[model samples]
Target chain A: SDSAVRKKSEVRQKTVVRTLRFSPVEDETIRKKAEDSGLTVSAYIRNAALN
Target chain B: SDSAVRKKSEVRQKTVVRTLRFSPVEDETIRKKAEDSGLTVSAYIRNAALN
Candidate 1:
């Protein structure tokens, strides 16, 4: 198989990862809110950071 | 001191936080891209995921 350099360049390097923790009640509430916004939890938090 | 309950509700309850790591080169590039797109690094990556 040939390595596609173009695709590699286009792909953003996600060399970093993170973990977070929260109480069960908080997590449940946040998950519900994120779903209501039609965004994954990560995306919801990202948007929340600014707005 | 008055503990404003209304403001407290409006305030996003950030009970959790996470940190990410990146190569210095990649970090600089990503930071510039985020600024170009008028978003913080976190928001830029979040939008990138869907778009």
Candidate 2:
């Protein structure tokens, strides 16, 4: 279950689909922390998400 | 080198050496929780301390 009326964004390439949406502030924080830790924001977020 | 006290309990016939000490309040709490959980206080304390 996800938020109702959520803005949707999807990236699809080579049979892979990555979908995500979040507030700008949250995304920025995660991005900044992720980059500072020497990781792509996407990769950091993916790992955090999985772990 | 031993400050160990060895005692025998009919309920504990196993041949092993284990020693521990607990503060009065802590020991009471541990004993109560163990009793509530239907375990011997020694078993409860051992599991909690190890884990």
Candidate 3:
């Protein structure tokens, strides 16, 4: 099993997702920040949680 | 011989490189986040931009 690559951790890591309605200006700002950080919105928010 | 081998290096991929400095506290913080996200420090910082 070790050589077969089964996971050792029983608690699977979780990914967070969200849906939001934003005005074009706010949306652009979000996009700009994400782009500046080189992440997608989902990735950016996920990273923020870790930070 | 029905066929011959063909060269496959017609295109190349590129990766970007960057350098940054942080206080030890900041550095460890980044490292911790990367560990949580299953990424390296560089990848963790990169992901912070997308959200």
Candidate 4:
């Protein structure tokens, strides 16, 4: 039998996905600010990134 | 003094609060794309946007 060192797949319990790869808290902060900036985090994040 | 700390809103130095709409699913795609392109979602977001 070939040695398959597949470390059992780990399951995460987190339900909410912070797609930006930020810690939930950090993500929330960014999102909150984005909204406060009068735009969606999508726009704000992209805008910030671009400019 | 009824509540000295309730005036927290008074501290922002003033800023405009903009509100925009976006979908979580869309945001996730952007973040994912950013990742494949480069580093942290933030970094990639900026880089790709710049490009």
Candidate 5:
């Protein structure tokens, strides 16, 4: 499991491709949603972003 | 709250400055860590990314 030794790339980003809703209003929305999910703010971003 | 009302641009992902390790091996590593946290895989990514 030691790859990336022969291929090269740049600026395409990678994986899961979740999004951030960059508005304070939505921030409050998600903030409350995360609280309901038994999560901290960071944990909210953590699960949603990676998933 | 209630900010960002017409000053928008592009191509800079936001918040917390966390990262994803784009390696399959590391995937397995975090996979288990999420389990220990009592999280689903998506939940793991969610909490970590948003955090």
Candidate 6:
């Protein structure tokens, strides 16, 4: 059980990378909305994507 | 003058990439603090690094 937990922790420690692209106008709109929500553009996008 | 302005706009449109590594505990702390600030982890770190 302990080793299983440790293994899970190790796996989570590995880095994950994701990339996204946006059009200029879309980017501007996202930034404005993020600013209004008091979130960084990236965070706002991440939250929205998850939902 | 218009070209210079256009170039500046192009610069803003460019995407910037950065990477950071953190320990599990530190990562949790940062996420919590970022949540409190209503910002994303990346934004919190970026703001801190800039200041």
Best by TM-score: 6
Candidate 6: CAPRI quality band: incorrect
lDDT of 3 by residue, B1-51 (tens): 233565455433233222333445555676687898799765565446334
Q: List model 4 lDDT by residue over B1-51, tens digit each.
A: 236867655553233333333355555675677677667765665344334
| Poorest lDDT segment (10 consecutive residues) of candidate 6 chain B | B13-22
Q: Could you tell me how far off, in angstroms, the CA of residue A33 lies in candidate 6 after the best superposition?
A: 0.5
Write down the worst ten-residue block by lDDT for model 3 chain B: B11-20
Cα deviation of B36, candidate 4, in Å: 16
* TM-score of the second chain, cand. 6: 0.59
lDDT of 3: 0.53
- DockQ metric, candidate 6: 0.06
Tell me the native contact fraction for each prediction: 0.27, 0.00, 0.03, 0.12, 0.18, 0.00
Q: Write the per-residue lDDT of candidate 1 for residues B1-51, one digit (tens) a residue.
A: 336564543556545555645555555676788898789776565555334
> What residue runs in model 6 are displaced by over 4 Å at the alpha carbon?
A1-15, B1-51
Candidate rank order under TM-score? 6, 1, 3, 4, 2, 5
Residue pairs clashing in model 3 are A34-B49, A37-B49, A39-B49, A39-B50, A40-B50, A41-B51, A44-B51
Error of 4 at A25 (Å): 2.3
The window of 10 residues in a row where model 4 chain A has the poorest summed lDDT is: A11-20
- Give per-residue CA lDDT, model 4, range A5-37, as digits (tens): 854565442233333344455556666778788
Model 2, B3-31: lDDT tens digits are: 34744323432332323334455545655
TM-score of chain A of each: 0.60, 0.58, 0.47, 0.53, 0.51, 0.64
Superposed Cα deviation of residue B34, candidate 2 (Å): 34
The CA lDDT at B3 in model 3 is 30
Name model 4 segments beyond 4 Å from true.
A1-19, B1-51
Where model 3 places Cα greater than 4 Å from the true spot, the runs are A1-51, B1-16
Ranking by lDDT: 1, 6, 5, 4, 3, 2
Question: Candidate 4 chain B: worst 10 consecutive residues by lDDT?
Answer: B13-22
lDDT tens digits by residue: candidate 5, B1-51: 233784555534444333334344445666677788888765666456546
TM-score evaluated only on chain B, model 1: 0.56
